[PDB]
Amino acid sequence: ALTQPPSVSKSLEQSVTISCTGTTTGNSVSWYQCHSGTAPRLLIYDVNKRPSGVSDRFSGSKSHNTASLTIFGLQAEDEADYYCGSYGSGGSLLFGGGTRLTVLGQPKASPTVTLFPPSSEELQANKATLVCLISDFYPGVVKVAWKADGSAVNAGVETTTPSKQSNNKYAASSYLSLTSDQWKSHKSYSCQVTHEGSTVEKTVAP
Amino acid sequence: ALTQPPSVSKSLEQSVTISCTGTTTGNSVSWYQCHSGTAPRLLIYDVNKRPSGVSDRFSGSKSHNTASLTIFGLQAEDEADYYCGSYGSGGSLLFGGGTRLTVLGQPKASPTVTLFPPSSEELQANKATLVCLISDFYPGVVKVAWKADGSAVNAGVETTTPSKQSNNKYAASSYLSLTSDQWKSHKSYSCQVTHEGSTVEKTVAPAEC
Amino acid sequence: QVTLMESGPALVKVTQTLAVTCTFSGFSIRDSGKGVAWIRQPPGGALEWLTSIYWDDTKYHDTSLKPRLTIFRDTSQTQVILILTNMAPLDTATYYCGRINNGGGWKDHIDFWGPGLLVTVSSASTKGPSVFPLAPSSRSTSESTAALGCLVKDYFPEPVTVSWNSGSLTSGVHTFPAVLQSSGLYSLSSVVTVPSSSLGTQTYVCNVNHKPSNTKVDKRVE
Amino acid sequence: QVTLMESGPALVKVTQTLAVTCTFSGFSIRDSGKGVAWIRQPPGGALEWLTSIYWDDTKYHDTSLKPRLTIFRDTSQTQVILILTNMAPLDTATYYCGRINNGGGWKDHIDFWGPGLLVTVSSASTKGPSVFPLAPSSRSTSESTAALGCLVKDYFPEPVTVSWNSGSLTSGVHTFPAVLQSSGLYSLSSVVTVPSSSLGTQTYVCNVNHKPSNTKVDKRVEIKTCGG
Ligand SMILES: *[C@@H]1O[C@H](CO)[C@@H](O[C@@H]2O[C@H](CO)[C@@H](O[C@@H]3O[C@H](CO)[C@@H](O[C@@H]4O[C@H](CO)[C@@H](O)[C@H](O)[C@H]4NC(C)=O)[C@H](O[C@H]4O[C@H](CO[C@H]5O[C@H](CO)[C@@H](O)[C@H](O)[C@@H]5O)[C@@H](O)[C@H](O)[C@@H]4O)[C@@H]3O)[C@H](O)[C@H]2NC(C)=O)[C@H](O)[C@H]1NC(C)=O
């Protein structure tokens, strides 16, 4: 095998649709939801029939070789993860790639990259980190750059992906690698990354 | 299943037997020890036969009922527990009931001790664990004279069944794990213990008084 | 209705075996359209297949798993059990048990599930350091916008048990999510812009655990 | 060479399975003379076998728990796994894996044993160790056998380890009877035997490590006394 797109969007009570592969022999192929890895929910028996005790804001259609979850009226649950899957053969499953979606049309979120400096006490932990905070981007995006004035660097791999938020204002972090010996070697690091085309400097002190 | 006696007793450097005496229809046999709860130690690789471990003082011997282990040069290790192992009723394996051996007429000795109030990390938590390391004693038995300010039996008591040591002689270390009201009421802790006879002494001042 | 209670260990070393248990409410009938299943997922990735029990003692699995895997119930002990050999680190996953039902001749329903669990896996190679301060005891940030602690030294496996928000204040003090810092070794903390300076008015002194080496730890300066 | 070990988790909820594993070293999976078994040790007392494999790749176990027990070895690992289905509190024991050796014609003994692993069944769960140094303190020095230690309280389950000076100074050490607290938690005061008078010219450092977590710690204790 199956395939699914990465993401799609429109606003609440609007219509949008999500692609999947499928087969005519495996027409018992069906859509699903799972919210941040919790407690999955099936949507359709085979590709087109909603089971009893499942609601009706949506359709997978009779679309055979390509299962096709359209939505009539979007709701806040429609940026949980959603999956496509089917019976295999001989006692085996078949299962698809997922999609986190977004309900873009919500308020958005902009432009909250920020830097908190280390404290001298942090050096006790073998750290003097760039607390390079990342929230409020829409949709969530960043690209690599970094600087530490004329110094050499040992930056690590500290940037997270964009991720779930308590108010849906999408967020991450990039808390740069700074160890106590690296700090003594290089000192003046800065939070230079393109948070939806915006950035901050505030070069650090203890 | 394979019955065994609970124990038997002979004295230092003497000799004795243990045997396994139940449904011993199986007739090639092996024997094993456990001591201080450490990983069990073999003795007999077939009923009359032994390898490099204790190649003289033990001996293996044949009988249809009494699957028999015979032992000479009895020493401070012979407070251990001992087990038979016949091969089983085809494709099958067995153990005996065990025998916690009890060599008698040995030395043992009243204690030698370290005894202390708690380090300040518990006083900062309002608890007051004075400790006596009741230690280095023989035989592996206790009778208590630690009556001073109720010290023998309060809060976290391991004034209880002893353990062996690497110095051979047993230990039974124990707490007074009360609140700081310990120092407000208990002020001496004379850790006297008896081992068929005699005593030794240690105490300390209270921590906060 | 039906329910599917799911239970197992939380955490284990790499190279070990895994096993897990699940028990239903509603019937255990050997016949019927009904069958049983299991699923897993590494965090940061998709849900995936393992194995199923059909009607009768019919069972199967993906051949890609075969030698690692085995599966048996004891319904006289009311239980379904799954068993797996020698975890590589990427076998660290969410897990779930589930139910199947019959439609047409060899076509079937795939629809209902237990609560699921994190099967944690890691190297045992870990240390006993404390948590440490970020506090205004040195000029990191002003008293009106700071957090005081919740950093643990460094180690090979993530994570530190970092959390923020989840009260009634779902907005304005919304989170800054974190999962890694390759600071010579792996490492975690995170911060929110709230006032603090001390434990004097609220619980801003932040104390924490490192999950691959369970020992909760505390440190304070103010 | 021979070596053997029973690696697994420490504790379990009553109705769950136990599942645990053991490893070959110094020998072959094909030895006509020698094979592998599992065993368990009832608390403070008796001993109880379970099951075996041999080089012939046949299998055996005691009748008396049959449906409750399982063995196999995955040849892609060549490591041996023991499983038990649904516990009771009285399954709490040291489990042991071991190498069988045979004169043959159905004549066997066990040639080597691992260290064992302790297993505890409960409705409860783990509680982290709490730690502080043991030495002759501000009000004492004149002990009748002098001692130093890493004192640990309120732990569960049992497994923990100790030594002094980079984890090498280990003179006159042993396990005392473990303390129980009525909450179900446990405590210890095990020690290295070391002179109290030497500290002005020869002085010492604690080393300790848990096991349900590998919470390894060292702590200097070099000047702790202030009186006789
Ligand atoms: C041509 O046709 C032939 C027949 O005409 C075929 O021969 C047959 O081959 C099979 C093996 O492929 C063989 O299987 C037998 O299966 C039994 C049942 O599974 C097994 O018994 C075990 O019993 C316990 C009881 O609790 C069960 O729990 C076990 O699950 C069970 N199975 C297993 C896998 O354990 C039979 O066991 C044989 O082996 C023991 C050996 O014991 C001695 O050797 C040990 C070596 O380590 C030693 O430690 C011991 O001390 C013992 O000294 C014997 O005791 C048994 O009597 C038996 O011999 C067995 O595996 C059939 O038995 C074969 N049939 C005959 C009549 O021999 C042949 O494969 C065909 N070939 C071709 C080319 O087509």
Side-chain angles (χ1 to χ4, degrees), chain A residues 1-107 109-206, chain B residues 1-107 109-209, chain C residues 2-222, chain D residues 2-228:
Chain A
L2 298 177
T3 62
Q4 299 186 233
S7 188
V8 296
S9 298
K10 245 179 281 186
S11 200
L12 288 86
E13 293 293 331
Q14 304 186 333
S15 176
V16 78
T17 189
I18 309 156
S19 185
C20 173
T21 290
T23 61
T24 186
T25 53
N27 62 72
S28 202
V29 55
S30 298
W31 286 96
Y32 295 85
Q33 186 203 65
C34 179
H35 207 333
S36 65
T38 69
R41 166 147 45 96
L42 169 143
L43 307 184
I44 322 291
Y45 283 175
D46 310 336
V47 75
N48 66 327
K49 293 163 291 182
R50 313 192 198 88
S52 300
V54 175
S55 193
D56 308 86
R57 301 184 300 97
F58 40 72
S59 179
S61 77
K62 205 184 178 180
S63 64
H64 48 72
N65 297 337
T66 172
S68 291
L69 176 55
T70 185
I71 299 96
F72 288 115
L74 279 160
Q75 281 295 336
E77 72 168 333
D78 307 320
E79 72 167 276
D81 207 340
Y82 288 78
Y83 290 87
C84 185
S86 186
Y87 173 57
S89 65
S92 67
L93 185 65
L94 175 64
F95 233 61
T99 175
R100 171 56 188 65
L101 310 174
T102 33
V103 191
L104 306 175
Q106 285 165 108
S110 185
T112 310
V113 63
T114 287
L115 175 59
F116 272 34
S119 92
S120 184
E121 299 75 12
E122 202 195 330
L123 292 164
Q124 301 168 228
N126 186 36
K127 313 297 145 215
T129 301
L130 294 195
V131 180
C132 186
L133 302 127
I134 299 174
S135 188
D136 323 345
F137 47 10
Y138 193 96
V141 292
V142 274
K143 305 181 64 174
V144 68
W146 306 103
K147 62 187 180 183
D149 301 341
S151 187
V153 295
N154 185 10
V157 201
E158 323 305 39
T159 314
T160 78
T161 52
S163 65
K164 184 178 175 183
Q165 183 68 279
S166 61
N167 64 359
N168 305 354
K169 296 202 290 190
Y170 312 118
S173 57
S174 191
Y175 301 153
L176 210 69
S177 64
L178 313 193
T179 60
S180 299
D181 53 350
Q182 180 188 354
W183 169 267
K184 289 176 180 184
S185 303
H186 304 151
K187 195 175 179 180
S188 208
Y189 284 94
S190 307
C191 175
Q192 167 48 354
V193 286
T194 68
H195 182 81
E196 65 163 29
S198 72
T199 188
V200 292
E201 206 291 328
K202 207 174 185 178
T203 197
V204 291
Chain B
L2 291 187
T3 49
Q4 274 186 236
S7 198
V8 67
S9 313
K10 285 284 290 183
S11 200
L12 197 86
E13 310 301 351
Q14 306 186 344
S15 179
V16 78
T17 180
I18 307 170
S19 78
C20 163
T21 63
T23 59
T24 55
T25 57
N27 48 77
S28 170
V29 185
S30 61
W31 271 90
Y32 309 88
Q33 174 260 62
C34 183
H35 191 38
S36 71
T38 59
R41 307 306 292 183
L42 65 94
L43 300 168
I44 300 304
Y45 71 79
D46 186 18
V47 63
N48 301 331
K49 320 289 283 184
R50 55 169 163 30
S52 311
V54 71
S55 320
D56 49 11
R57 276 194 296 141
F58 287 71
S59 58
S61 67
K62 184 74 177 286
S63 149
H64 291 87
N65 181 275
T66 59
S68 288
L69 187 72
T70 294
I71 318 177
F72 178 107
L74 267 43
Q75 286 161 36
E77 64 271 30
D78 294 307
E79 294 145 38
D81 187 2
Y82 296 98
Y83 290 81
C84 67
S86 179
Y87 195 72
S89 307
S92 295
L93 192 145
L94 293 172
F95 284 119
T99 297
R100 183 72 72 152
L101 186 62
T102 52
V103 174
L104 90 181
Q106 298 193 92
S110 44
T112 43
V113 173
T114 279
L115 188 168
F116 54 95
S119 300
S120 72
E121 295 81 1
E122 206 185 55
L123 301 177
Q124 294 155 226
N126 199 19
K127 269 80 174 187
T129 309
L130 185 142
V131 184
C132 178
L133 309 190
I134 304 162
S135 193
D136 318 332
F137 63 82
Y138 235 79
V141 301
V142 300
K143 291 183 176 181
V144 297
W146 191 18
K147 300 188 184 181
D149 302 341
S151 299
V153 188
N154 67 81
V157 182
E158 296 304 331
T159 317
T160 56
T161 308
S163 64
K164 274 287 206 184
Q165 297 192 101
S166 51
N167 72 25
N168 176 52
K169 304 178 184 174
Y170 289 82
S173 305
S174 188
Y175 292 174
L176 291 71
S177 187
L178 293 171
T179 51
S180 61
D181 316 290
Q182 169 66 2
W183 318 121
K184 311 180 200 170
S185 61
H186 308 154
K187 297 183 180 179
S188 190
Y189 324 99
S190 303
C191 191
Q192 296 202 60
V193 192
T194 289
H195 307 275
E196 310 196 345
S198 76
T199 60
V200 171
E201 293 172 50
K202 184 56 169 45
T203 193
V204 289
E208 296 197 314
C209 301
Chain C
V2 182
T3 75
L4 297 177
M5 191 284 291
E6 185 168 349
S7 186
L11 173 149
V12 69
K13 202 200 301 183
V14 171
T15 81
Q16 298 291 129
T17 51
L18 170 70
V20 289
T21 72
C22 177
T23 283
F24 41 72
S25 79
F27 58 79
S28 64
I29 286 164
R30 298 308 303 122
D31 200 353
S32 84
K34 203 167 80 170
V36 180
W38 295 88
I39 293 296
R40 77 175 191 175
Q41 175 254 13
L47 284 71
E48 63 165 24
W49 162 245
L50 296 173
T51 182
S52 176
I53 312 301
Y54 230 40
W55 69 95
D56 292 347
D57 302 331
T58 315
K59 65 188 68 169
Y60 225 70
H61 43 272
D62 174 8
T63 185
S64 79
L65 310 177
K66 170 61 181 181
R68 300 183 67 193
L69 182 147
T70 192
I71 158 60
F72 64 91
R73 75 179 197 286
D74 183 348
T75 190
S76 87
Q77 299 173 10
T78 70
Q79 279 165 337
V80 183
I81 314 166
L82 174 63
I83 306 96
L84 175 67
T85 70
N86 296 58
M87 304 296 263
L90 83 181
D91 296 294
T92 301
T94 322
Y95 271 79
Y96 275 87
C97 66
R99 175 272 190 101
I100 300 301
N101 234 72
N102 176 226
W106 230 240
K107 302 190 197 296
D108 296 326
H109 313 94
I110 308 173
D111 75 358
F112 190 66
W113 321 97
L117 292 173
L118 171 56
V119 177
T120 325
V121 200
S122 282
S123 179
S125 62
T126 58
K127 300 183 183 182
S130 67
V131 72
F132 295 95
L134 295 174
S137 167
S138 194
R139 294 289 90 188
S140 51
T141 57
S142 186
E143 318 318 314
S144 63
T145 196
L148 308 183
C150 284
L151 172 65
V152 181
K153 192 178 178 179
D154 51 44
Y155 42 70
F156 175 62
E158 294 292 3
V160 172
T161 64
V162 176
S163 63
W164 281 114
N165 205 274
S166 79
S168 57
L169 301 177
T170 60
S171 63
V173 72
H174 57 293
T175 73
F176 292 101
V179 71
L180 173 65
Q181 179 198 46
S182 65
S183 59
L185 277 182
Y186 291 7
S187 168
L188 261 178
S189 66
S190 197
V191 177
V192 300
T193 58
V194 73
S196 56
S197 200
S198 69
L199 230 173
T201 59
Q202 241 171 21
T203 60
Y204 305 121
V205 176
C206 194
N207 303 311
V208 81
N209 197 346
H210 174 242
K211 202 168 185 172
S213 67
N214 178 17
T215 293
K216 191 170 181 177
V217 284
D218 316 85
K219 190 59 56 178
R220 182 174 178 199
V221 300
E222 62 184 48
Chain D
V2 170
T3 184
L4 298 172
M5 67 301 292
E6 298 83 356
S7 305
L11 80 171
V12 61
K13 303 288 187 73
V14 169
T15 64
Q16 299 177 326
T17 55
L18 178 66
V20 296
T21 302
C22 177
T23 317
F24 304 164
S25 183
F27 65 84
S28 107
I29 194 171
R30 313 315 307 151
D31 299 347
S32 174
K34 298 187 182 181
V36 170
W38 277 99
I39 309 295
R40 71 179 187 172
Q41 173 248 295
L47 304 175
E48 179 165 77
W49 123 287
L50 302 171
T51 182
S52 158
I53 184 169
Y54 295 89
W55 59 269
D56 57 28
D57 316 298
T58 68
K59 302 171 188 167
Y60 312 81
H61 32 248
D62 168 29
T63 57
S64 320
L65 299 173
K66 176 177 180 181
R68 214 181 181 231
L69 290 173
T70 282
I71 182 167
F72 78 96
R73 60 92 194 80
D74 173 354
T75 56
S76 75
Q77 333 294 346
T78 67
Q79 293 207 43
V80 188
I81 307 158
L82 176 72
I83 297 189
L84 199 158
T85 60
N86 181 317
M87 327 304 292
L90 51 53
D91 295 305
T92 292
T94 316
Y95 292 71
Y96 272 97
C97 70
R99 180 159 161 86
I100 317 170
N101 178 25
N102 46 256
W106 281 303
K107 297 182 179 176
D108 307 10
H109 62 258
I110 168 166
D111 187 24
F112 291 96
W113 310 61
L117 181 61
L118 290 134
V119 174
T120 302
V121 179
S122 192
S123 192
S125 192
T126 184
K127 208 283 192 289
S130 65
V131 186
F132 49 82
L134 179 173
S137 192
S138 62
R139 298 182 175 204
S140 203
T141 289
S142 300
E143 310 318 313
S144 61
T145 33
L148 301 176
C150 311
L151 197 160
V152 193
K153 302 192 68 183
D154 291 327
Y155 57 82
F156 176 73
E158 180 280 337
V160 65
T161 61
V162 64
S163 178
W164 277 58
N165 292 30
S166 75
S168 69
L169 172 58
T170 320
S171 50
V173 179
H174 238 60
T175 56
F176 302 145
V179 188
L180 177 149
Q181 300 93 251
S182 308
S183 58
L185 305 183
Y186 286 80
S187 313
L188 65 88
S189 186
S190 181
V191 289
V192 193
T193 299
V194 184
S196 62
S197 305
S198 71
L199 302 176
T201 62
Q202 182 185 12
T203 190
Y204 319 99
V205 178
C206 158
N207 160 251
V208 65
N209 182 30
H210 184 216
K211 185 171 183 175
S213 169
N214 194 77
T215 307
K216 56 180 293 183
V217 178
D218 298 2
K219 223 297 182 183
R220 62 182 291 250
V221 205
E222 290 178 313
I223 60 162
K224 200 68 177 178
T225 187
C226 314

